[PDB]
Structure 1
Amino acid sequence: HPLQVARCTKIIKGEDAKYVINLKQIAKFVVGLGERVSPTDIEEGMRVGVDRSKYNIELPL
């Protein structure tokens, strides 16, 4: 996956112990901790992966 910011626009599933990551001007959801070999994160409002701000979808798809 290409992407220039991550944007999972909801995140019900998934410091911190759960992901809620959405990198945008108009709102923000911020979690510092990626990984998540179960559920395998991603899904949601799809652009997902590492961020040009380094919050980061680290390693789902």
Structure 2
Amino acid sequence: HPLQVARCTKIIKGEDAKYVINLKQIAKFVVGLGERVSPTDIEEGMRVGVDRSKYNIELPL
């Protein structure tokens, strides 16, 4: 759903077992693990999708 970089602006919801994606130049939360439906789907700025830094939020909604 339309985006060019991913935003969830902190992620309240959820080795690693929780996933925070915010790809902007200012504020970078970089997870090196992708793979997952985990928070209970899209959240906090709704633009879950594809990165220009490869955090790779794979497949919630």
- Give the match's secondary structure for 1:3: coil
In the alignment, structure 2 segments of 5+ residues that lack a partner are: none
For the aligned residue pairs, the C-alpha RMSD in angstroms reads: 1.8
Provide TM-score, normalisation by structure 1: 0.77
- Alignment CA distance shift 1:39-1:24 (3 Å): closer
Measured after TM superposition, the shift of residue 39 of structure 1 is 4.0
1:8, CA displacement in angstroms? 0.4
16-25 or 47-56, which moves further after superposition?
47-56
Instruction: Measure, in 1, the Cα distance between the counterparts of 2:24 and 2:16.
Output: 20
Gaps of 5+ in 1: none
Closer, same or farther: CA 2–26 of 1 in aligned 2, 3 Å: same
TM-score (norm 2): 0.77
Conserved in 2, the CA contact under 8 Å of 1:18 and 1:31? no
The percent identity for this pair of structures is 100
Report Cα offsets for 1:1-23 as digits up to 9, x if no partner.
Answer: 12110010020111421111100
* 2:13–2:40 CA contact under 8 A, matched in 1: no
Whole-angstrom distance in 1 between the partners of 2:6 and 2:32? 13
Aligned residues: 61
